């Protein structure tokens, strides 16, 4: 009944490894909100307490869409910042790790809203940098044939990281990769020089099979730290299946390698990747029959991972 943050404290990255404050290997495992502008009602202390105590998650991710055309942060900065702070404060109150996700998507080049990102992250780092719970995810899913590591993503990340690190010298930063955070193989050609940086890989088990695991293995062998800050049991659309046999191959692979993972998503949208059945209580306490096939799987994986840790 020690909380995850009480037990593990300030995290650190050495090579590809995530270690806790006591120099022990540590794996974050949890779940992401869907876009806060659409499903933010699930980002609250009561829901997060269920995740901590019943699901055995140790991290939550706050998916703050940026795109004004998605009613994201550029359109409604005050409401969304308020919701992010509610989410962060809930995690602080529960001793959970929390990822603040600048959730680019259709705004596919992170440079589009770079200065707004810097102002947002400067505020979050000032507010919350003293706490070891906080993790900054600075660009969810760069995508597009022009948006490559060398040309667009790395220069964005270098500027945003220098902004954050001027205020919060220690907390983890997760940096997106090209092709919807698949192009982790490009990082080793020119990595970022800073402390406590990990590189995102995202997968959807209806789409992404062993080939992407093979890429991840090659990245790890080359010394690139990987964090799975978003993955689904559906096709990449968020719907279809779910594809739990393939998802199981992924979870085994990630657990064997100690790679942190965060499932998409904790909401009740009528799509296969949503963890909750439509009308589920925003306050948590969900019986198995209020979880989808995907939600049941994720809850089971989280519980099993904790069991395997305590005994092996």
Domain 1-312, classified CATH 3.40.640.10, yes or no: no
In what helix (H) or strand (E) does residue 181 lie, and over which residues does it extend? helix 178-181
Q: Which position among 230, 245, 271, 307 bears the catalytic label?
A: 230
Q: What are the strands, taking DSSP E only, across the chain?
A: 12-14, 17-19, 29-33, 59-65, 97-103, 134-137, 173-175, 197-204, 226-232, 261-266
Q: Is 69 annotated in some ligand binding site?
A: no
Is 60 within 8 Å of 229 (Cβ atoms)? no
Give how far Cα 283 sits from Cα of 48, 240, 266, 277, Å. Answer: 8, 27, 12, 14
Give the separation between CA 179 and CA 19, rounded to whole angstroms: 28
1 counts as catalytic: no
Is 170 annotated in some ligand binding site?
yes
Residue in 137, 141, 246, 271 annotated catalytic: 141
58 is annotated as contributing to ligand binding: no
CB 108 within 8 A of CB 143: yes
Q: Are strands 12-14 and 17-19 parallel, antiparallel or unpaired?
A: antiparallel
141 is catalytic: yes
- 120/151 Cα distance (integer angstroms): 23
- The method of structure determination was X-ray
Resolution in A: 1.6
């Amino acid at each position: 009944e020690r909380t995850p943050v009480e037990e593990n404290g300030r995290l650190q990255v050495v090579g590809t490894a995530l270690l806790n404050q006591h120099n022990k290997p540590f794996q974050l495992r949890g779940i992401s909100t869907h876009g806060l502008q659409w499903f933010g009602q699930f980002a609250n202390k009561d829901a997060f307490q269920t995740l901590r105590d019943d699901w055995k998650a140790n991290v939550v991710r706050l998916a703050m869409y940026t795109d004004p055309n998605a009613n994201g942060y550029i359109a409604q900065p005050e409401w969304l910042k308020a919701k992010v702070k509610e989410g962060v404060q809930a995690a602080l109150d529960l001793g959970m790790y929390v990822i603040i996700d600048w959730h680019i998507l259709n705004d596919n080049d992170p440079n589009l809203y770079k200065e707004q990102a810097k102002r947002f992250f400067a505020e979050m780092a000032r507010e919350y940098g003293k706490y070891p719970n906080v993790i900054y995810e600075i660009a969810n899913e760069p995508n597009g044939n022009d948006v490559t590591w060398e040309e667009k993503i790395r220069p964005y990340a270098d500027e945003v990281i220098r902004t954050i690190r001027s205020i919060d010298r220690d907390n983890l930063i997760i940096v997106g990769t090209g092709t919807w955070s698949q192009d982790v193989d490009d990082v080793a050609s020119d990595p970022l020089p800073y402390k406590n940086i990990m590189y995102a890989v995202h997968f959807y088990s209806g789409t992404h099979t062993q080939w992407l695991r093979d890429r991840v293995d090659a990245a790890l062998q080359a010394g690139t730290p990987v964090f799975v800050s978003e993955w689904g049991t559906s096709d990449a659309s968020g719907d279809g299946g779910p594809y739990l046999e393939e998802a199981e191959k992924w979870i085994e692979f990630l657990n064997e390698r100690g790679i942190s993972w965060v499932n998409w998503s904790l909401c009740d949208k009528n799509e296969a990747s949503a963890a909750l059945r439509p009308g589920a209580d925003p306050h948590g306490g969900w019986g198995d029959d209020h979880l989808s096939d995907s939600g049941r799987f994720i809850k089971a994986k989280l519980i099993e991972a904790l069991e395997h840790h305590h005994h092996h």
